[PDB]
């Protein structure tokens, strides 16, 4: 029975969800027995860039409340020198999880996942900010819904339970020496995996094989035939190397993969 207060509420700890460096998530409930997730960072091993990556976040969070329900809640927030709570809906399982139970995906909930995603992306695109970390475990399912976490500002933390370069766009990598479709091709890869059941480039096991095949235009991604024609269509057109070529999200928005 450890309790956390915050803003002068108290919340009891279910259980531990996730945690990382000078950080921890819990499932927690209020005194109505409503259930939250609480977002936990210790200040005081925190360094200084932790800090200000952690207010960009917060302010972000916020601010794009009002804007959209694919955006992940935020109720309630304490920061100290000392420490940040952050009070937060809490989702049924992370959508990196659910992938992983290997299970039949229902076509039509994979689309429904698909527009809610793009949703949230889009959103996050309108005030100018650019995810670049997106991944299936950025994303939240809360009542069939999927919902962004993060904007990719703050650092990680990671799942805990009681029981990867794969998404890294080819400009991420020749940059070594940013756009919005840099997500379009990582919301790409995700979709490649709902789709598939695997991600372009997992076969390769070769980390710099890897980062050179995602580079390498000789390299061709696969594309199995499917029943959907289109979602095809979209797979391919999030795939494409050059970022002036490959599809933008408002563009998405519009396909008919997402409005038929
Ligand atoms: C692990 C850190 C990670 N997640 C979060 O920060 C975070 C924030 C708000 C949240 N609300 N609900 C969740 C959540 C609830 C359930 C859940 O799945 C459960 C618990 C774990 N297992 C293995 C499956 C069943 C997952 C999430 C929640 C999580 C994080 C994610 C993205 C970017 C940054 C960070 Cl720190």
Known sequence: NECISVKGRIYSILKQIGSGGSSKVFQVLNEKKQIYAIKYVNLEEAD??????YRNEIAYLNKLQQHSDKIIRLYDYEITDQYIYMVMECGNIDLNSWLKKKKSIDPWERKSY????????????????????????????????????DFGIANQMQPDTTSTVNYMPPEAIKDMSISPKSDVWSLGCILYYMTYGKTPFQQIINQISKLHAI?????????????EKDLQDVLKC????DPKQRISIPELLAHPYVQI
Do not use: Y
């Open 114 to 149: 698909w527009k809610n995603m793009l949703e949230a992306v889009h959103t996050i695109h309108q005030h100018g900010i650019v995810h670049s970390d997106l991944k299936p475990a950025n994303f939240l399912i809360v009542d069939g819904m999927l919902k962004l976490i």
């Open 48 to 53: 200084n860039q932790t800090l200000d990556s």
């Open 215 to 227: 580079i390498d235009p000789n390299h061709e991604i696969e594309f199995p035939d499917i029943p």
């Open 238 to 241: 999030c795939l494409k190397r």
